[PDB]
Amino acid sequence: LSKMSSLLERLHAKFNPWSETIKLVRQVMEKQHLVSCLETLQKALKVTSLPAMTDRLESIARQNGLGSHLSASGTECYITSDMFYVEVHHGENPVSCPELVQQLREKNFDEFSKHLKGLVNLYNLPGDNKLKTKMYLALQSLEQDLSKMAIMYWKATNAGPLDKILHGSVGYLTPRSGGHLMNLKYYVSPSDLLDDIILHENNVSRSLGMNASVTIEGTSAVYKLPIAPLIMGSHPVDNKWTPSFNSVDLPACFFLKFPQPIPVSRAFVQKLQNCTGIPLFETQPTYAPLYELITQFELSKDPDPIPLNHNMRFYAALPGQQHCYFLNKDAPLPDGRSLQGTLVSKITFQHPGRVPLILNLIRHQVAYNTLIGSCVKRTILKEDSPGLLQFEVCPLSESRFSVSFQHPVNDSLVCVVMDVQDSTHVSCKLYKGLSDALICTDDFIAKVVQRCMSIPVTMRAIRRKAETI
Amino acid sequence: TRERLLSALEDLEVLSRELIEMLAISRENQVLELLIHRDGEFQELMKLALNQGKIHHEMQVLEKEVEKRDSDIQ
């Protein structure tokens, strides 16, 4: 069909040729990614003979805007600011990264181009010359302190990688390599730990979970940051930080950028800000219902051309039974205002002292988002007469929500109120009428949820356990 | 099967040339499809080249045997 249309295009070229196409490309030149992807596609064997290659590397720099100086055929250096690296300012060449060496030795010039882009973004700092060198030094001190704090947790408890990610000081931390900055993994959702029962080992993927990056970024305001490692003396349990001043008032703060903005509620902003004065969003922007933002984050994880047009009526299909969940945004909280929140991408912290507290609040907000997020789905359940056991989620207190469903055996509405008090310790209470059939034991539901994943799922277990009895 | 072998090789050559033109136009998943469909075709043509190698062994001796018998019979 279209393979015969590709044969038709070849016939058209013959009527016209490959040489003519090359001439047209040359004329366009006179007037990156795809190549490397399809190059691995080809790679039964790799390019052995490589006459120039230097010319392509010069071209890659030209497109980047970097400056290339080459000493001999073997060594070529791309130099800008302190971002100087050589394939054979204020610091020694740190490492022969296997990551960069492997990509260059194999036919992946595209991957090398991405790595340079990362290095350029890290050093897109407004400050230049001496101011930039000190600012980088501050980032190095923060990295050393965060690394030590992670080491202390491992010494105190020999926890497995999963425990460190879910409930540990800092988080699984990978030290910065080339352009990539330090990544602290705040949370690994139970459903996504399982892929199509993954055992993490020390080989935990960079993106196999929720990850946050620590970096220095320029700010309009002026702040004091440690310019030397501040954990000179460490109390054996937890950490002790020697007081500031050393430090200098650089016009920037340390940041905890999140790759995908996390929807966060107004209550969390107050709970977090209690610990840290630094204004998170400073200029008060927009603040609408949280449940809408949670749906957008979940729906946009996988992008499709047609907007779901859910009307907050998400439909879920499960191995046994069919369920419809109404998210009920706009339900009044005790204060009389619907849960309202704004996406947060960057959180700024001066020192790491308040960081353990800030992360614990974030873990709770992320966990609540994941349980409510598991329901959001692209289901076209239209005219569904059989099954269709529908249940709904009204926000009744910041950090609490109620899923309401008809009693599985009897007829009265029964509601499970779940509060995300902890990241791994949501506490749920079943509300059932005085005359009703014992629907479930709170512990059995917990065991099924922990062994498996998500909350659309929790409702199935509640229905199945009641029916089995 | 010689005519079929020639045609099979010709199909690979013309489609590869058109793919080069498409790559010049490009600079996504259509070129990814073009690459993986070309993969199957030229890998089967590499198996036909392995058969051409054995044609330069067994089939070559067989052809020589027929030619030698002709002259010997005469």
Binding site: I22, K23, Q42, L45 | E13, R17, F42
Partner: peptide, 29 residues
């Protein structure tokens, strides 16, 4: 054959039209 074409692909990435012409001569061979 294709191993020579793989060498031709390396030249095309490096630059090219001459390599495609070489592939046509290889088809004559």
């Amino acid at each position: 054959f294709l191993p020579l074409v793989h060498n031709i692909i390396k030249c095309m990435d490096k630059d090219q039209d001459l390599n495609a012409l070489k592939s046509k001569f290889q088809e004559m061979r």
